[PDB]
Amino acid sequence: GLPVIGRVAADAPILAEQNIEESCRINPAFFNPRADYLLRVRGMSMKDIGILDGDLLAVHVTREARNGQVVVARIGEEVTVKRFKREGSKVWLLAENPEFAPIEVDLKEQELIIEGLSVGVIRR
Amino acid sequence: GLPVIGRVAADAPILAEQNIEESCRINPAFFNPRADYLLRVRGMSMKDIGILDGDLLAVHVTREARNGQVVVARIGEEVTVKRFKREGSKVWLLAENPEFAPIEVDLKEQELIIEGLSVGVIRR
Ligand SMILES: [Ca+2]
Ligand SMILES: [Ca+2]
Fold this sequence. Notes:
Two copies of one chain form a homodimer.
Chain A: E1 2-5, E2 20-24, E3 37-40, E4 56-60, E5 70-75, E6 78-87, E7 90-94, E8 103-106, E9 112-123
The complex binds calcium ion (CA) (2 copies).
């Protein structure tokens, strides 16, 4: 199965037991690459690629992201779902909804952790 | 489980073994109402409500449809996913994409079977 993560505690691994709201019986290998957890998406910042408020993002754990990838990012202690774009020592977390400005991260002043790579979505 | 269904054979039920590619281990009651199958969507006709080419539509089997519901419909032996609209003896199956014109059905002339209601999506 796959854990469903609703809240993300500060300064703790995302896959910590205390973050798990419930469980889904779907096999991890349903997705490719294999999913490690499902994360509830909040808001409509990614609606133009069909990821809507309340969807569950299937997430493959990785700490490195490549330009163009849809990633889960922790900026400070806030978790967001955004498209990744790195400009040298700058990172852009791009929304897929013209109503939301790109979030700029200066890797020198702000902590950024990539929590993983989107490998799918479950909508219910 | 939930059977995953690709192409659909003529004059056989959608849940016929010959249509099933594999089973997903997700619980049918993960969805509400409960799903009966997952159907592979083709093309971008429903993109405006976040249903994209290749998505698996979670479907609750029912044979009746109400105006504005996103349904699986079979006209002759072509299966489509569209928004239902009926006035008297005529039905329009509406796209959620401005580039796609309505499919019109004359219920006096053509058989229309509702195969079910959309209750969710799995994208992988
Ligand atoms: Ca920290
Ligand atoms: Ca598939």
